[PDB]
Design a protein around this motif. Sequence first.
Motif, PDB file in Angstrom:
ATOM      1  N   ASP A  46       0.990  -1.535  -0.072  1.00 42.80           N
ATOM      2  CA  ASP A  46      -0.054  -0.119   0.147  1.00 42.80           C
ATOM      3  C   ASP A  46       0.999   0.908   0.169  1.00 42.80           C
ATOM      4  O   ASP A  46       0.671   1.951  -1.101  1.00 42.80           O
ATOM      5  N   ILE A  47       1.918   1.637   0.778  1.00 43.03           N
ATOM      6  CA  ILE A  47       3.058   2.524   0.889  1.00 43.03           C
ATOM      7  C   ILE A  47       3.588   2.565  -0.376  1.00 43.03           C
ATOM      8  O   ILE A  47       3.162   3.396  -1.271  1.00 43.03           O
ATOM      9  N   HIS A  48       3.530   1.274  -0.979  1.00 43.94           N
ATOM     10  CA  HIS A  48       4.590   1.986  -2.470  1.00 43.94           C
ATOM     11  C   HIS A  48       3.768   2.258  -3.864  1.00 43.94           C
ATOM     12  O   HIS A  48       3.914   3.461  -4.547  1.00 43.94           O
ATOM     13  N   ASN A  49       1.835   1.724  -3.853  1.00 45.42           N
ATOM     14  CA  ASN A  49       1.023   1.896  -4.363  1.00 45.42           C
ATOM     15  C   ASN A  49       0.760   3.466  -4.087  1.00 45.42           C
ATOM     16  O   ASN A  49       0.218   4.113  -5.457  1.00 45.42           O
TER      17      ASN A  49
ATOM     18  N   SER B 186       2.631   6.145  -2.797  1.00 41.94           N
ATOM     19  CA  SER B 186       3.508   6.839  -3.828  1.00 41.94           C
ATOM     20  C   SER B 186       3.610   6.579  -4.990  1.00 41.94           C
ATOM     21  O   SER B 186       3.973   7.297  -5.881  1.00 41.94           O
ATOM     22  N   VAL B 187       3.500   5.740  -5.697  1.00 43.83           N
ATOM     23  CA  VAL B 187       3.413   5.731  -7.284  1.00 43.83           C
ATOM     24  C   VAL B 187       2.241   6.368  -7.479  1.00 43.83           C
ATOM     25  O   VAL B 187       1.888   6.918  -8.802  1.00 43.83           O
ATOM     26  N   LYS B 188       1.344   6.483  -7.331  1.00 44.68           N
ATOM     27  CA  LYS B 188      -0.057   7.496  -7.515  1.00 44.68           C
ATOM     28  C   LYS B 188       0.294   8.974  -7.128  1.00 44.68           C
ATOM     29  O   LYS B 188      -0.334  10.072  -7.288  1.00 44.68           O
ATOM     30  N   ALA B 189       0.800   8.607  -5.802  1.00 49.35           N
ATOM     31  CA  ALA B 189       1.228  10.670  -5.608  1.00 49.35           C
ATOM     32  C   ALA B 189       2.802  11.396  -5.977  1.00 49.35           C
ATOM     33  O   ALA B 189       2.812  12.068  -5.929  1.00 49.35           O
ATOM     34  N   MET B 190       2.665  10.538  -8.317  1.00 53.31           N
ATOM     35  CA  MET B 190       3.705  11.171  -8.090  1.00 53.31           C
ATOM     36  C   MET B 190       3.538  12.653  -9.516  1.00 53.31           C
ATOM     37  O   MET B 190       3.952  13.626  -8.377  1.00 53.31           O
ATOM     38  N   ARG B 191       2.771  12.839  -9.023  1.00 54.34           N
ATOM     39  CA  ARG B 191       2.270  14.229  -9.817  1.00 54.34           C
ATOM     40  C   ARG B 191       2.630  15.246 -10.551  1.00 54.34           C
ATOM     41  O   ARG B 191       3.285  16.009 -10.226  1.00 54.34           O
ATOM     42  N   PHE B 192       3.143  14.560 -11.727  1.00 54.02           N
ATOM     43  CA  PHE B 192       3.395  15.889 -12.884  1.00 54.02           C
ATOM     44  C   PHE B 192       2.364  16.749 -13.135  1.00 54.02           C
ATOM     45  O   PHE B 192       1.431  16.905 -13.191  1.00 54.02           O
TER      46      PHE B 192
END
Lengths: 152, 59, 61, 286, 104, 232, 94
Positions: free
Chosen positions: F218-221, F223-229
Amino acid sequence: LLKLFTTMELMRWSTLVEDYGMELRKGSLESPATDVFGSTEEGEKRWKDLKNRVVEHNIRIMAKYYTRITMKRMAQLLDLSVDESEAFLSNLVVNKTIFAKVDRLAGIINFQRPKDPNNLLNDWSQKLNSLMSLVNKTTHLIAKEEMIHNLQ
Amino acid sequence: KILFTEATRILFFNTPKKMTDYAKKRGWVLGPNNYYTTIPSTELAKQVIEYARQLEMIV
Amino acid sequence: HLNKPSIQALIHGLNRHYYSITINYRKNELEQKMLLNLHKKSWMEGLTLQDYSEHCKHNES
Amino acid sequence: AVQKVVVHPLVLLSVVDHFNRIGKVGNQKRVVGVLLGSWQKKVLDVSNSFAVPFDEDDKDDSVWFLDHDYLENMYGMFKKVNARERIVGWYHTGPKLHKNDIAINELMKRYCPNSVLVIIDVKPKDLGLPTEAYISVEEVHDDGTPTSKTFEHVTSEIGAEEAEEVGVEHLLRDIKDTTVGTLSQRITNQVHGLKGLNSKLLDIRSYLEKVATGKLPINHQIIYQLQDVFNLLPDVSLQEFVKAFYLKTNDQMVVVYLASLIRSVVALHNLINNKIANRDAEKKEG
Amino acid sequence: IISTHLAKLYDNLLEQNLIRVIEPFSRVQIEHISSLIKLSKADVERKLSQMILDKKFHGILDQGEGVLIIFDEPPVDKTYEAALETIQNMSKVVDSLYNKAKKL
Amino acid sequence: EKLVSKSVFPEQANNNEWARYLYYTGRIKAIQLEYSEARRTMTNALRKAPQHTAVGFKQTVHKLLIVVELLLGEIPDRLQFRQPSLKRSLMPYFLLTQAVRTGNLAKFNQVLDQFGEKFQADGTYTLIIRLRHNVIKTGVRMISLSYSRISLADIAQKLQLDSPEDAEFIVAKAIRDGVIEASINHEKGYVQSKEMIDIYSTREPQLAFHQRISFCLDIHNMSVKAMRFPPK
Amino acid sequence: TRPANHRQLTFEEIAKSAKITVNEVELLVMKALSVGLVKGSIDEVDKRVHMTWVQPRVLDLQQIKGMKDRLEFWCTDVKSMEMLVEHQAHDILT
């Protein structure tokens, strides 16, 4: 006698004498007593030596085809006291030819080191892909019985 | 296992008949001599499949 | 004109004495499925566990 | 004799081409040809084949034609082309063996003593049946049974050498392949293995249905091998196997903590860098 | 220089006797080993305790009944040895990431 | 408490508000007697508590976690009684903990009479009443952790219970809760504890690892959703 | 008779059944291993014998039906777990 000492199955010392002892310790009319098992001092030395050789042949054949034997029971299955049997099994194991490990109440004769998890799952996985002899089973049930399927 | 006599002593039922009724009221029974896992391989399999899912299917 | 002629062929007379004809491979579904058996492992190795000791050594490395 | 028979992905295509070119009008559904190849007293590999003019009649399954001088002529032509392959066996479509299979094998045993039947399944390619190779053996039926021939199955592999497997790859290179095993492809492989196991199960159950009601004779070695295989099943009980929890949790160490926590930390590190990078980009822009 | 040296030799040969025997056994009474080795119960008990404490001979002593037990420690633990050290390695990584967060 | 049960806190809420909500529900369930979840929640909140600021917050949280722990039998760590920002403030509670660990009713009574104003000042005077009445359970807790088996007469001797039947009743009440795992043998008088089976080959590590790896996934997912380009 | 549910056979069973003394069960087991019919092992300590044997027999058509039912049970277990894994991994199978 050489059969009972070469083929498998336990060597009963009691019936060993009752079947061959008029013929080992005594001299048969057909063939006189061997100079290795007479009443001479070397004869009695070899006599106790064979009383321990039934022990070692027993131990070897059980090493291939037993798992555990109890100290009282194997002692009476070779007709000795416990201590001398333990000593002789010690001599068999020290020179690296027999696997054993003795307890005061168990006296198990095996190294089954007991099958480690890695090894026992290795055996199970082997039997599973040995169960993949099921593929040979089904391909043979279809092939050798397809020459029956066309014969109905 | 708890003995009949000591149970009657500590169950605070002064009448032994009362103690017997309160014993029958529960499943806690008298006893003969007066003396009262597997690998589920499904939920864990679901767990590892879930791990693979979180590795796959992109973000 | 989808593919480019090569220098090697060009020097050896391509487009001067002969032209390169585009090559297309007629491959129907049946032949594809049969060729797929060359590396279709089996129904067995999908159930055959890797050696546990080798697994532990690989994991340790 | 042969502990394995290797079928190159060229004789497969040869059989498909023969079946197509015939079944354009040739609704016999089964066509017979000769397959050559390097011959070893060890694992046998089939490198090439040709199609002989074969005729079969459905009447009594005993009247059929195989032009053997055609067989010899084509083999001579292949020798001229490549003397290295020698007549090894034969092929036919129609996965259901007919009655003339063994007779044809006896006919062809003269050109090569160890002739092997190699059946090629063309249409049914569902799970696990690319081919089945058979060899006749000289035993009546068993120790105490009357005469028969009883083609013997040999383990078959589909293997290619260099400069043939590359042609296969170029013919391939659709969305298929991906030789490296991703987690997705490995789980798919497990599912396919379960499916194949179930299909084999249904096959053996069907034969046992045919035998139990008396439609098919009890075949003693079959029943024996059954009793063996259901004897051979393991036991998940006997709580010494169950101590596989040891290695399961040992695996859970390397999958659960090490790589997963490392991946989480790596993802967070990629996150913060973007958050600085976005912040720096904003600052460069009030 | 000969009392100390021969005392050391006597201790070493006692050790060699105690390892050269008991190899056949996995669970043998201290009385048996003492009678076979001709020492007092207390002295041989102290010697075995010293032997195991020095990790010279793997085992453990259950004096609550008075028996010596034998086993081996599997070396698969290397994976956990790597695991824990990598854990605090990633901990230092996380500390550096915390500093980078303080930058933000 | 009733409002809490029907209200679900947002997971996206900021760290400090999450810590505040955790503190509030922990106090609610601590005065509501849900001590295990109480201590779990206050430990979580202290992990989420600011390190530098919120001195009063961390002080109140430390006080209530101390009382919750020793009500459950757990002894608070001495280091939290050592930082300068907390030392003199917990000094009343430090003397409280000294009396609790010593367990002498005389020093206990003197500490109560000397610091009852501090005890009620945090709304813990009833809490310290239950504390004074659970110190005995705490004592039984270390007694059973130290001893695999112990006669109830020995229990009364080491605990000053003056009666084997009183010791039997008190130990039965204590073992009712999840404080001590044992197997009482009244045939002979054993308090034989459960065999400490190997934690490995027991599926417990598998469950703990499953929960932890799910947390990391969940932490990794997230984090990868919160990249926010950005757009440009 | 016992379908491996309790493989460990106590020497009383072999003694009463085979009408032998418990001293001779070990001997006859050894003989059977030697000839090549069974490949088990003997636990004298607990008076048990482990059996993993590869000798089949004729199978009494009713027994054919029973083994058919056993096959049906194991095949439906296989099928059920196949559907379970397929449903759980449908996201990944694609």
